[PDB]
Every structure is written in C-alpha cells, then in structure tokens.
Amino acid sequence: ADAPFEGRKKCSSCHKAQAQSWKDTAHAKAMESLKPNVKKEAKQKAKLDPAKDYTQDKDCVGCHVDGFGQKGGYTIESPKPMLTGVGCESCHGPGRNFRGDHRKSGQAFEKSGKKTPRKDLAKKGQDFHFEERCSACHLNYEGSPWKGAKAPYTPFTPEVDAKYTFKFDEMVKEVKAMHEHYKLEGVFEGEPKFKFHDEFQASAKPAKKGK
Ligand code: HEM
Ligand code: HEM
Ligand code: HEM
Ligand code: HEM
C-alpha cells in the first residue's frame, strides 16, 4: 500500500525556503525542455526534433513530472501544474499520507518539544535514501548499470555526451541541482536517516525566507 502523490503545493507552503530555491533548478523547469525550440542544441545532439512539441509525449513526460503512471501522479489527460516539473515528491516520495504527519509532528514539537521517529514517516511513504528514485530517471537507459531500466529510456546518455554520466553520491551533493539546504530544528529523529543528512545540516543555511 504505497502512498498517492498529491503535488508540490502543500510541501511548498510549509517549506518556503526550499521551494524558493527549488524553483530555480533544472528539475523545476523540466517540462520547459519538452517544449518546441527549447534546448535545440541538446536535442540535435541526441537526434531528437528541436521543433517538436514533446509536452504530451508519453515517451518523455514521465521523467519531467511528478508520479507519472503512479497513483495521484501526473497524467497527460489532466496535467496538474503542481505535478509539472520534477518536484518535491519525485525525490522525497509521494506525500499524501506523510504530509499530515509533518503538520501534526510539527505542532507536537512546537507545543511540547516532542520528537517523532522518521520510521513513522518512512511507513507512510517518505523516502530518506533517494538513490532508487534518482536512478529511475537518470540511469534508465539500455544496458545501464541500474538494473531497473526499462523503456521509455532517457535520450540523454553517456553515449550522447559524458556530461550525462550519473553518480548518485556526487550529484546528490550538488545543491544547485537539489535545492539549498536549510537548518532543521529536529522534529524528526532516528532511522531511516539519509546518509548525508548530518553533513548537509552541519553546513546548512539558517531559516531563510518564510518565517
Ligand atoms: C510535501 C509532501 C512535503 C515534503 C516533500 C516535505 C519534506 C520534508 C522533509 C524532507 C523534511 C525533513 C525530514 C527529516 O528530518 O529527515 C520535512 C520536515 C518537516 N516538515 Fe515537511 N514536507 C512536506 C509537507 C509539509 C507540510 C504541509 C508541512 C506543514 C504543515 C510540513 C512541516 C514540516 C516540519 C514542521 C518538519 C520538521 C522541521 C524541523 O525543523 O525539524 N511539511 N519535510
Ligand atoms: C535524486 C536525489 C536526484 C539527483 C541526485 C538528481 C540530479 C540531477 C542533476 C545534477 C541534474 C542536472 C542539473 C543541472 O544541469 O542544472 C538533474 C537534472 C534533471 N533530472 Fe534529476 N536528479 C534526481 C532525481 C530526479 C528524478 C527522480 C527525476 C525524474 C522524475 C529526474 C529528472 C531530471 C531531469 C529531466 C533533469 C533535466 C531537467 C531539464 O533540464 O529539463 N531527476 N538531476
Ligand atoms: C522524449 C523523447 C524526451 C525528450 C524530448 C526529453 C528532453 C530532454 C531535454 C531537452 C533535456 C535537457 C538536456 C540538456 O543537456 O540540457 C533532458 C534531460 C533529461 N531527461 Fe529528458 N527527455 C525525454 C525523455 C526522457 C525520459 C523517458 C527520461 C527518464 C527515463 C528522461 C530523463 C532525463 C534526465 C535524467 C535528464 C537530465 C540529464 C542530465 O543533465 O544529466 N528524459 N530531457
Ligand atoms: C519541493 C519544492 C521540495 C521541498 C518542499 C523540499 C523540502 C525539503 C526539506 C524541508 C528538506 C530538509 C531540510 C533541507 O533543506 O535540507 C529537504 C532535504 C533534501 N531534499 Fe528536498 N524538497 C523539495 C524538492 C526536492 C527535490 C526535487 C529533490 C531531488 C532532486 C530533493 C532532494 C533533497 C535531498 C537529497 C535532501 C537531503 C535530505 C536529508 O538531509 O535528510 N528535494 N528537502
């Protein structure tokens, strides 16, 4: 019983600093790349049509939106702006079930300092590991080292250009590709905890924008 996707809106309303930074990332602009005449040079190199409209192409949208083919996720028939672009749930997991726990646990902490185990969030679908999710978009090509690969494949592979080589441990540390990291008070605790969480929090910026 995995959880349904719902879109970025509620996440962004509670996490304004991360949302503001995420908006400037290539992930947030992913659907723009599928539009005609955008990234013409890159498309030519990959032997795609620079003038074609790929925004409703099922061979392309799944890696440029949230939750394609998944419950509550993006559909070409009724495409939600809040699921357009690679958004919050594409990395952190579909949020319909865990988002309410962020609200309740946040209120419990503000009122009484009570912390909540991350295990409770993982049970509700939140992802604290990320690698498989990033890989399903970035390493989904024929003969890829990632064994979950299956069509449709990304046209942007190491064969096309070495700049498309993907190494999770390196790229998850590119803030300009994730979003800047801001300091957490520590409402959630324990495992499963992302392997680089303490590192990211140790150099995180202070609560910038919102509250
Ligand atoms: C939308 C589904 C959504 C996402 C995505 C999201 C992510 C998120 C992360 C990654 C954390 C950190 C967890 C950890 O410590 O490992 C986090 C923490 C908090 N959130 Fe959140 N969050 C989403 C939605 C919401 C909503 C709608 C609210 C507000 C009602 C909210 C609140 C919080 C709070 C509070 C925390 C703890 C912050 C702290 O300082 O420790 N989130 N969220
Ligand atoms: C998982 C945490 C994850 C990582 C790590 C990751 C990295 C990453 C980088 C470094 C880029 C390049 C950014 C830039 O050049 O400015 C990038 C770009 C795209 N990604 Fe990604 N990405 C992660 C996760 C995901 C997921 C889950 C998907 C598919 C739903 C995905 C897709 C894309 C796409 C598409 C781009 C390009 C956007 C564009 O320019 O149109 N990524 N990612
Ligand atoms: C479908 C034919 C399709 C199109 C069209 C498309 C376009 C596209 C562009 C223009 C980019 C940016 C490349 C650049 O160098 O700036 C881009 C990037 C990524 N895509 Fe995409 N894409 C199409 C399909 C798919 C599919 C089916 C997947 C996932 C299986 C996918 C994934 C990605 C990823 C990952 C990137 C980022 C590459 C990087 O910069 O590292 N795309 N796409
Ligand atoms: C979508 C706009 C979005 C939100 C909202 C969001 C929130 C969020 C929080 C609150 C954290 C913890 C504090 C911090 O700033 O580090 C957090 C951490 C990570 N995120 Fe995130 N995040 C949003 C989008 C995305 C996207 C699209 C990706 C993947 C390309 C991504 C990845 C990460 C990673 C990795 C971390 C570190 C996790 C940790 O330290 O526990 N986020 N995000």
UniProtKB/Swiss-Prot annotation:
Q: Which GO terms describe its cellular component?
A: periplasmic space
Q: Where does heme 1 bind?
A: 11, 14-15, 102
Q: Where in the cell is it found?
A: Periplasm
Q: Where does heme 2 bind?
A: 60, 63-64
- A Pfam family of this chain: Cytochrome_C554
Amino acids binding heme 3: 88, 91-92, 179
Annotated keywords: Electron transport, Heme, Iron, Metal-binding, Periplasm, Signal, Transport
NCBIfam families linked to this entry: Cyt554_Nsmonas
Protein's recorded name: Cytochrome c-554
Q: Which organism is it from?
A: Nitrosomonas europaea (strain ATCC 19718 / CIP 103999 / KCTC 2705 / NBRC 14298)
Its taxonomic placement starts with: Bacteria, Pseudomonadati, Pseudomonadota, Betaproteobacteria, Nitrosomonadales
Query: What gene is this protein a product of?
Result: cycA1
